Design a protein around this ligand. Structure first.
Ligand code: HEM
Ligand code: HEM
Ligand code: HEM
Ligand code: HEM
Lengths: 141, 146, 146, 141
């Protein structure tokens, strides 16, 4: 699972993310939409043009939820309970897509951190994002 | 796989700037560190007992360079990828028995590495072309037995 | 995909005994029940709110019959699967946007259903040929965009 | 997660499995080896001919471990801890293979239960086998 070193590497990168919640989240979403266009069908009600108000506002919410997960890393299922029911029962998100967005978020992190997105940092975020993804899907099992 | 002139340009343009040895060492080290079961296939490489040991492992680095050189052969001939990787396909599938899922995983790692190395050039559109690239190489290597 | 005469026999022999409507209804119902996100694609089918509702859903059953009939078109022409499924590939990929992973999942469900229906005939060797079959159909449908 | 109904459906099928632990486990393993021959490379020290002593003895151990998991379904990580370290640290089993064996076990169940391997039973075992697989791999994360 996540070690204390993992958590420290995560928070160090995160306090930067929290400074630009809207930019980061929108960039992750647009990389997903552009690289994996099938994911766009979950957002027919969104204007999906670059930097649309809907993309930016939603980006901030996604990053905000991930920030909540960072705080309550040891109590993920409970903390994300409402979101889990939302993505499974209401939105019926295909689990493969949680991996796609997780991956795109890592690309955004890599782009912004450059040299500082070390293997150790990537491992930490991979474990974190996989843990969050498992929870958002746990209502399928 | 019907590349647009724009996609081909995103690929050849970025690759010309790539430090193959550096990006290759990073990609392979990250594969071994992020997905530890892949270490099963590298018993002869010596000490892989920690992330720092892996990053300082000379053969991991040299091997990563050869792997990224191989990707270069896809970049250099975008319309004949399936054929370029036929022998390697036989190698990974019939000799090494690497599950094809891991080809996909290495591809994703390379996408992330390229992002850390080219923050400006690696736009969503560039990522789309390069993701199409690594997926085509993974698919070509997976033909080896399916 | 280079079928051996023995594989072709495992396939055609078993299929001739298959109750397409029954096996098809089972496979689709089980897809919707075991992997609930797949229900996203069947909003027009009416009540899918429970396992029992799904198993009694007339359109789920009718649709499963059409899907297994489609698999029959692979059985009936084992060397031209890629081409037989080209139109369906376009349908699932460009129109429906079904992630390819789910093609693999339906294939696994069909393998299990065939096992419950043919305990004696469905030996490990038979399973091997049929798994090769459902994977070839999944691969053919995945060409739709990769 | 697993419901009480899931657990009851599982135990009903399981007490039959426990009657033929060796047959069931060997059949699951051989379907994996034959259908997914790459998995055979984990067993170079085994005679992999049909019904070999090594396959049958190992089959019984696999079924026995699954039986232990059934008993301690609410305490899986702890109960399988030693096995988790074995498959991750020692054997370095690719996570995809846990899904292959799980699938083959379901085929064996379907073959032996026929009509009684209902969708409800399959769901129950799918959730169970996925939970066990997650634990045997958790040392990778
Ligand atoms: C990193 C994993 C993810 C997290 C943390 C996450 C978080 C959230 C949150 C907090 C909301 C509610 C926003 C609000 O209340 O305004 C939301 C909505 C939504 N999510 Fe996700 N999500 C994730 C992955 C996904 C994926 C993979 C998809 C599918 C491609 C998806 C599709 C949606 C949709 C369609 C909505 C409805 C939003 C609207 O109508 O504005 N999500 N998500
Ligand atoms: C899909 C992207 C991949 C490409 C393009 C690729 C390419 C290559 C090439 C060109 C070689 C021969 C190296 C030489 O010239 O000495 C090689 C060897 C090898 N590859 Fe890959 N490979 C890929 C993925 C993988 C994966 C995912 C694994 C397993 C986790 C793997 C395991 C191996 C092993 C074990 C060798 C043998 C090398 C030795 O014994 O020194 N490869 N690969
Ligand atoms: C790889 C095995 C599959 C085969 C051979 C297959 C075959 C077909 C065929 C032949 C049709 C047209 C039915 C008609 O004639 O009315 C169809 C429709 C459809 N399929 Fe599939 N399919 C497969 C997998 C899937 C999966 C995995 C999904 C999503 C989870 C899916 C979702 C749909 C949907 C939504 C329709 C539209 C039907 C309607 O609106 O009534 N299919 N499929
Ligand atoms: C349903 C999930 C699985 C369970 C419950 C399980 C359980 C076990 C147990 C209890 C042992 C030790 C037997 C003994 O002490 O004699 C074992 C050994 C082993 N397992 Fe698994 N296993 C699972 C999946 C896998 C998979 C997917 C692979 C790889 C294809 C694998 C490869 C091995 C190997 C190589 C051994 C060493 C056994 C020997 O040398 O006799 N296992 N497993």
């Amino acid at each position: 699972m996540l070690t204390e070193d993992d958590k420290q590497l995560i928070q160090h990168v995160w306090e930067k993310v929290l400074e630009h919640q809207e930019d980061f989240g929108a960039e992750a979403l647009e990389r997903m939409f552009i690289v994996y266009p099938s994911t766009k069908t979950y957002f027919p009600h969104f204007d999906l043009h670059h930097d649309s108000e809907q993309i930016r506002h939603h980006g901030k919410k996604v990053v905000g939820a991930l920030g909540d997960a960072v705080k309550h890393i040891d109590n993920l299922s409970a903390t994300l309970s409402e979101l889990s029911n939302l993505h499974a029962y209401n939105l019926r998100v295909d689990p493969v897509n949680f991996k796609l967005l997780s991956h795109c978020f890592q690309v955004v992190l890599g782009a912004h951190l450059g040299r500082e997105y070390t293997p150790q940092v990537q491992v930490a975020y991979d474990k974190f994002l996989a843990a969050v993804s498992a929870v958002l899907a746990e209502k399928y099992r | 796989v019907h590349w647009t002139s724009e996609e081909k340009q995103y690929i050849t343009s970025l690759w010309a700037k790539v430090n193959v040895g550096e990006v290759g060492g990073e990609a392979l080290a990250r594969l071994l560190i992020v997905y530890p079961w892949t270490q099963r296939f590298f018993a002869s490489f010596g000490n892989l007992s920690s992330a720092n040991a892996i990053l300082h492992n000379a053969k991991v680095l040299a091997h990563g360079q050869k792997v990224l050189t191989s990707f270069g052969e896809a970049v250099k001939n975008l319309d004949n990828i399936k054929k370029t990787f036929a022998q390697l396909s036989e190698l990974h599938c019939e000799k090494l028995h690497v599950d094809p899922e891991n080809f996909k995983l290495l591809g994703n790692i390379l996408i992330i590495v390229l992002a850390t190395h080219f923050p400006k050039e690696f736009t969503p559109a560039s990522q789309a072309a390069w993701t199409k690239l690594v997926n085509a190489v993974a698919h070509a290597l997976a033909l080896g037995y399916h």
